[PDB]
Write an enzyme that holds these catalytic residues in place. Structure first.
Site, short mmCIF file in Angstrom:
data_model
loop_
_atom_site.label_atom_id
_atom_site.label_comp_id
_atom_site.label_asym_id
_atom_site.label_seq_id
_atom_site.Cartn_x
_atom_site.Cartn_y
_atom_site.Cartn_z
CB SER A 19 4.45 -1.05 -9.33
OG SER A 19 4.78 -1.68 -10.55
N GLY A 23 0.93 3.85 -7.62
CA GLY A 23 2.32 3.85 -7.18
C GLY A 23 2.97 2.48 -7.16
CB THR A 24 5.93 1.09 -6.33
OG1 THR A 24 6.04 1.71 -7.61
CG2 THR A 24 6.63 -0.27 -6.37
CD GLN A 88 -1.27 -6.74 10.46
OE1 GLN A 88 -2.41 -6.32 10.22
NE2 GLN A 88 -1.05 -7.91 11.05
CG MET A 90 -2.66 -8.01 4.69
SD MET A 90 -3.56 -8.58 6.15
CE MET A 90 -3.64 -7.07 7.11
CG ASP A 134 -9.67 0.45 -8.04
OD1 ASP A 134 -10.18 -0.33 -8.87
OD2 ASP A 134 -8.43 0.55 -8.00
CG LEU A 135 -15.00 -3.86 -3.86
CD1 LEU A 135 -14.11 -4.14 -2.65
CD2 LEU A 135 -16.46 -3.85 -3.44
CB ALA A 137 -10.41 -10.25 -6.57
NE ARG A 138 -7.00 -3.58 -9.22
CZ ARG A 138 -8.07 -3.49 -10.01
NH1 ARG A 138 -8.56 -4.57 -10.62
NH2 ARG A 138 -8.65 -2.31 -10.21
CG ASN A 139 -7.71 -2.63 -4.86
OD1 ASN A 139 -6.48 -2.76 -4.92
ND2 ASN A 139 -8.37 -1.72 -5.56
CG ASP A 152 -5.26 0.05 -2.54
OD1 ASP A 152 -4.46 0.62 -1.77
OD2 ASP A 152 -4.90 -0.79 -3.40
#
Length: 274
Positions: A19, A23-24, A88, A90, A134-135, A137-139, A152
């Site tokens: 989260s 959001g979550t 989908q 990942m 908001d680029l 590695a987490r996105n 995102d």
């Protein structure tokens, strides 16, 4: 371009994956009408606000129309409790977690390939005039070891200081070239194998740090060649920074001879020339 509208009962959660501030994210299953097919799908529940609107639908349809190899496609949306973004699943997860877990089994080829793919995804976004904002590695998610997808994008259109360009911290001017800054940080994270940018440094001291000229350090496995490409992404003038066309072309050229540009230390030492 068509957006799918899913029933509340057609989506069933299993467990929480993570989260954020928006959001979550739920690992879920999706059942189309009847009882034949299921699916391994990810469910983003935004929590406050935005609302089933003509304005919302209009934005969701722009995101459903985003169609690349290295962008995640928005499969559908649910509305009934709150707004839920369906995607989908990942199974390998986000690139940030991946590069930390497989640190010892990731080579120069993959790392340079990820750079090319992320830049390619960003090119599509730029060509369609969608700024990601908001680029990181987490996105970026992992479909397969040699296949990552950016996610995102334009999530602020519905609703990260150390990834943001200096222009964005002060004047909030989000542009394609401010996304280039975030790309430089994203790839830095990859080269360091999941390194936290500006580690041990508070948030409010970032802007003054960047104005003095101080940027993130050269990653241990980087040659000055790949590192100067990074340094260019963090230029004070936005116009001076490279374009996503240039970055893709550069890491593509580096992907031909990968261990010429990234030195990862077998039992034998690897010796750089200049």
């Amino acid at each position: 371009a068509q957006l799918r509208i899913l029933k509340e009962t057609e989506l069933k959660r299993v467990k929480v994956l993570g989260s954020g501030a928006f959001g979550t994210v739920y690992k879920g299953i999706w059942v189309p009408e009847g009882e034949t097919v299921k699916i391994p799908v990810a469910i983003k529940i935004l929590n406050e606000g935005p609302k089933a609107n003509v304005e919302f639908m209009d934005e969701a349809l722009i995101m459903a129309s985003m169609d690349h190899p290295h962008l995640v496609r928005l499969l559908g949306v649910c509305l009934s409790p709150t707004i839920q973004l369906v995607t989908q699943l990942m199974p390998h997860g986000c690139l940030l977690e991946y590069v930390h877990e497989h640190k010892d089994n990731i080579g120069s080829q993959l790392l340079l390939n990820w750079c090319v793919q992320i830049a390619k995804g960003m090119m599509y976004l730029e060509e369609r005039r969608l700024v990601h904002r908001d680029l990181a590695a987490r996105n970026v998610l992992v479909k397969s070891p040699n296949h990552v997808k950016i996610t995102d994008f334009g999530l602020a259109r519905l609703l990260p200081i150390k990834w943001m360009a200096l222009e964005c911290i002060h004047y909030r001017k989000f542009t394609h070239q401010s996304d280039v800054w975030s790309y430089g940080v994203t790839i830095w994270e990859l080269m360091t194998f999941g390194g936290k940018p500006y580690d041990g440094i508070p948030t409010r001291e970032i802007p003054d740090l960047l104005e003095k000229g101080e940027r993130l350090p050269q990653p241990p496995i980087c040659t000055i060649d790949v590192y100067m490409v990074m340094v260019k992404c963090w230029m004070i003038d936005a116009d001076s920074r490279p374009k996503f066309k240039e970055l893709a072309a550069e890491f593509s050229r580096m992907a031909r001879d990968p261990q010429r540009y990234l030195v990862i230390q077998d039992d034998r030492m690897k010796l750089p020339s200049p």
